[PDB]
Design an enzyme around this catalytic site. Structure first.
Site, PDB file in Angstrom:
ATOM      1  N   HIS A 158       0.831  -1.221   0.000  1.00  0.00           N
ATOM      2  CA  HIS A 158       0.000   0.000   0.000  1.00  0.00           C
ATOM      3  C   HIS A 158       0.876   1.286   0.000  1.00  0.00           C
ATOM      4  O   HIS A 158       0.342   2.374  -0.103  1.00  0.00           O
ATOM      5  CB  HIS A 158      -0.954  -0.026   1.208  1.00  0.00           C
ATOM      6  CG  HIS A 158      -0.487   0.295   2.649  1.00  0.00           C
ATOM      7  ND1 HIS A 158      -0.243  -0.549   3.613  1.00  0.00           N
ATOM      8  CD2 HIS A 158      -0.286   1.550   3.197  1.00  0.00           C
ATOM      9  CE1 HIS A 158       0.087   0.124   4.688  1.00  0.00           C
ATOM     10  NE2 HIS A 158       0.064   1.417   4.465  1.00  0.00           N
TER      11      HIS A 158
ATOM     12  N   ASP B 210       1.382   1.899  20.076  1.00  0.00           N
ATOM     13  CA  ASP B 210       1.023   1.218  18.783  1.00  0.00           C
ATOM     14  C   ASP B 210       1.794   1.878  17.620  1.00  0.00           C
ATOM     15  O   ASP B 210       2.475   2.878  17.836  1.00  0.00           O
ATOM     16  CB  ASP B 210      -0.478   1.432  18.547  1.00  0.00           C
ATOM     17  CG  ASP B 210      -1.089   0.638  17.392  1.00  0.00           C
ATOM     18  OD1 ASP B 210      -2.224   0.931  17.057  1.00  0.00           O
ATOM     19  OD2 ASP B 210      -0.494  -0.260  16.818  1.00  0.00           O
ATOM     20  N   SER B 211       1.712   1.348  16.428  1.00  0.00           N
ATOM     21  CA  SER B 211       2.385   1.963  15.287  1.00  0.00           C
ATOM     22  C   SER B 211       1.225   2.871  14.799  1.00  0.00           C
ATOM     23  O   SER B 211       0.101   2.737  15.260  1.00  0.00           O
ATOM     24  CB  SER B 211       2.772   0.892  14.271  1.00  0.00           C
ATOM     25  OG  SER B 211       1.650   0.033  14.030  1.00  0.00           O
TER      26      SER B 211
ATOM     27  N   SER C 184       3.644   2.864   8.333  1.00  0.00           N
ATOM     28  CA  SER C 184       3.338   1.838   7.277  1.00  0.00           C
ATOM     29  C   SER C 184       4.555   1.455   6.448  1.00  0.00           C
ATOM     30  O   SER C 184       5.298   2.344   6.069  1.00  0.00           O
ATOM     31  CB  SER C 184       2.286   2.344   6.250  1.00  0.00           C
ATOM     32  OG  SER C 184       0.981   2.194   6.835  1.00  0.00           O
ATOM     33  N   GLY C 185       4.741   0.189   6.188  1.00  0.00           N
ATOM     34  CA  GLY C 185       5.887  -0.282   5.386  1.00  0.00           C
ATOM     35  C   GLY C 185       7.060  -0.604   6.246  1.00  0.00           C
ATOM     36  O   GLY C 185       7.923  -1.330   5.806  1.00  0.00           O
TER      37      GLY C 185
ATOM     38  N   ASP D 193       0.117  -7.735   1.715  1.00  0.00           N
ATOM     39  CA  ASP D 193       0.573  -6.323   1.701  1.00  0.00           C
ATOM     40  C   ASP D 193       2.119  -6.278   1.773  1.00  0.00           C
ATOM     41  O   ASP D 193       2.677  -5.946   2.796  1.00  0.00           O
ATOM     42  CB  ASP D 193      -0.037  -5.613   2.888  1.00  0.00           C
ATOM     43  CG  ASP D 193       0.109  -4.061   2.785  1.00  0.00           C
ATOM     44  OD1 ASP D 193       0.491  -3.516   1.761  1.00  0.00           O
ATOM     45  OD2 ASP D 193      -0.172  -3.377   3.753  1.00  0.00           O
TER      46      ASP D 193
ATOM     47  N   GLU E 227      19.127   7.497   8.097  1.00  0.00           N
ATOM     48  CA  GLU E 227      18.390   8.652   8.629  1.00  0.00           C
ATOM     49  C   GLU E 227      18.057   8.545  10.089  1.00  0.00           C
ATOM     50  O   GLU E 227      17.948   7.465  10.638  1.00  0.00           O
ATOM     51  CB  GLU E 227      17.031   8.826   7.926  1.00  0.00           C
ATOM     52  CG  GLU E 227      17.178   9.436   6.577  1.00  0.00           C
ATOM     53  CD  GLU E 227      17.346  10.955   6.744  1.00  0.00           C
ATOM     54  OE1 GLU E 227      17.234  11.649   5.752  1.00  0.00           O
ATOM     55  OE2 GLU E 227      17.586  11.451   7.837  1.00  0.00           O
TER      56      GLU E 227
ATOM     57  N   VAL F 291      16.656  17.187   8.602  1.00  0.00           N
ATOM     58  CA  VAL F 291      18.039  17.784   8.616  1.00  0.00           C
ATOM     59  C   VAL F 291      19.126  16.940   8.018  1.00  0.00           C
ATOM     60  O   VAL F 291      19.080  15.775   8.371  1.00  0.00           O
ATOM     61  CB  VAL F 291      18.441  18.046  10.091  1.00  0.00           C
ATOM     62  CG1 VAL F 291      19.871  18.617  10.260  1.00  0.00           C
ATOM     63  CG2 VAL F 291      17.429  18.936  10.751  1.00  0.00           C
TER      64      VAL F 291
ATOM     65  N   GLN G 181      -0.140   5.986  11.352  1.00  0.00           N
ATOM     66  CA  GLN G 181       0.158   6.411   9.962  1.00  0.00           C
ATOM     67  C   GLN G 181       1.524   7.059   9.866  1.00  0.00           C
ATOM     68  O   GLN G 181       1.926   7.820  10.730  1.00  0.00           O
ATOM     69  CB  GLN G 181      -0.956   7.372   9.473  1.00  0.00           C
ATOM     70  CG  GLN G 181      -1.101   8.650  10.266  1.00  0.00           C
ATOM     71  CD  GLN G 181      -2.286   9.376   9.621  1.00  0.00           C
ATOM     72  OE1 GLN G 181      -2.376   9.430   8.407  1.00  0.00           O
ATOM     73  NE2 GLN G 181      -3.187   9.935  10.369  1.00  0.00           N
ATOM     74  N   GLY G 182       2.245   6.776   8.817  1.00  0.00           N
ATOM     75  CA  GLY G 182       3.622   7.329   8.614  1.00  0.00           C
ATOM     76  C   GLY G 182       4.571   6.138   8.941  1.00  0.00           C
ATOM     77  O   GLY G 182       5.705   6.090   8.497  1.00  0.00           O
TER      78      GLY G 182
HETATM   79  N1  LIG Z   1      -2.961   1.405  14.228  1.00  0.00           N
HETATM   80  C1  LIG Z   1      -1.939   0.961  13.529  1.00  0.00           C
HETATM   81  N2  LIG Z   1      -1.150   0.026  14.006  1.00  0.00           N
HETATM   82  C2  LIG Z   1      -1.686   1.485  12.252  1.00  0.00           C
HETATM   83  C3  LIG Z   1      -0.519   1.111  11.557  1.00  0.00           C
HETATM   84  C4  LIG Z   1      -0.237   1.623  10.300  1.00  0.00           C
HETATM   85  C5  LIG Z   1      -1.124   2.501   9.760  1.00  0.00           C
HETATM   86  N3  LIG Z   1      -1.107   3.113   8.643  1.00  0.00           N
HETATM   87  C6  LIG Z   1      -2.176   3.834   8.596  1.00  0.00           C
HETATM   88  C7  LIG Z   1      -2.395   4.655   7.495  1.00  0.00           C
HETATM   89  C8  LIG Z   1      -3.371   5.663   7.590  1.00  0.00           C
HETATM   90  C9  LIG Z   1      -3.616   6.503   6.517  1.00  0.00           C
HETATM   91  C10 LIG Z   1      -2.890   6.345   5.346  1.00  0.00           C
HETATM   92  C11 LIG Z   1      -1.911   5.345   5.230  1.00  0.00           C
HETATM   93  C12 LIG Z   1      -1.645   4.481   6.291  1.00  0.00           C
HETATM   94  O1  LIG Z   1      -0.683   3.478   6.120  1.00  0.00           O
HETATM   95  N4  LIG Z   1      -2.961   3.742   9.665  1.00  0.00           N
HETATM   96  C13 LIG Z   1      -2.257   2.890  10.378  1.00  0.00           C
HETATM   97  C14 LIG Z   1      -2.575   2.396  11.642  1.00  0.00           C
HETATM   98 CA   LIG Z   2      18.677  13.625   8.359  1.00  0.00          CA
END
Ligand SMILES: NC(=[NH2+])c1ccc2[nH]c(-c3ccccc3[O-])nc2c1
Ligand SMILES: [Ca+2]
Ligand SMILES: [Cl-]
Length: 223
Positions: free
Chosen positions: A40, A171-172, A177-178, A84, A52, A57, A174-175
């Site tokens: 995704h 928890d993990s 992901s991957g 995924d 990084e 910076v 958004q941002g």
């Molecule tokens: N609760 C979780 N462990 C979680 C993990 C990854 C996510 N990634 C996202 C996400 C939200 C909006 C757009 C792309 C995303 O990967 N929500 C997420 C929620």
């Molecule tokens: Ca840097």
């Protein structure tokens, strides 16, 4: 990462940031020319940033390499997020050292109770957006299949596992992901999805990498 801590510069040497003019996803370096991330996170125009820590910076140790091709799993379903996983080949090999290093693929799947390290530059608030400048870390355990399936009834396939805290708070998000879920030195999961971030009884869901090791090895071998 919500409820996590600052990892410390280059303490997670396999972590990469996928950048298209801004950080949009994480990934894991598995060899000097290949990275594994989530299907995704796919888009064209990806620059992979290795070594990084502060993504806003340049501080030294960074290597910016463009992606030559991105291979999304052929059976990836964007509606269920089953399969995924995506492989990115880099235009040139990265120089590996102690700040940029690859992580090993697993030889067996992990069991529930296994403690893992999840890292990323994703949101640190469950309600609202607060993205950090430096890499955040979180230690979370893999949950049993009954607790995962009871939390997301009918949405978990055998290529997914839950890791996290049912009480909420860590928890993990958004941002993230991957990115990587590393347990006992092996890459066992990829940050895939969850309902909100750090909500009670809604743990994070991760791609079960042990099920794709033959595919990853065969695909890298033929490309
Ligand atoms: N609760 C979780 N462990 C979680 C993990 C990854 C996510 N990634 C996202 C996400 C939200 C909006 C757009 C792309 C995303 O990967 N929500 C997420 C929620
Ligand atoms: Ca840097
Ligand atoms: Cl079910």
């Amino acid at each position: 990462i919500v409820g996590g801590y600052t990892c410390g510069a280059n303490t997670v040497p396999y972590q990469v940031s996928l950048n298209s003019g801004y950080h949009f996803c994480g990934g894991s370096l598995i060899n000097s020319q290949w990275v594994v991330s989530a299907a995704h996170c796919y888009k064209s125009g990806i620059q992979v940033r290795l070594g990084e820590d502060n993504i806003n910076v340049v501080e030294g140790n960074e290597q910016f390499i463009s992606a030559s091709k991105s291979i999304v799993h052929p059976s990836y379903n964007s509606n269920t997020l089953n399969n995924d996983i995506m492989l990115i080949k880099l235009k040139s090999a990265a120089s590996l050292n102690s700040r940029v290093a690859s992580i090993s693929l697993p030889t067996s799947c992990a069991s529930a109770g296994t403690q893992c390290l999840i890292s990323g530059w994703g949101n640190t608030k469950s309600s609202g957006t607060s993205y950090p400048d430096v890499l955040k870390c979180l230690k979370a355990p893999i949950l049993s299949d009954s607790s995962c399936k009871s939390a997301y009834p009918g949405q978990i396939t055998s290529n997914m596992f839950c890791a996290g805290y049912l009480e909420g708070g860590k928890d993990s998000c958004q941002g993230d992901s991957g990115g990587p879920v590393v347990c006992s030195g092996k890459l066992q999961g990829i940050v895939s999805w969850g309902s909100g971030c750090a909500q009670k009884n809604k743990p994070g869901v991760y791609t079960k990498v042990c099920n794709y090791v033959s595919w990853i090895k065969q695909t890298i071998a033929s490309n």
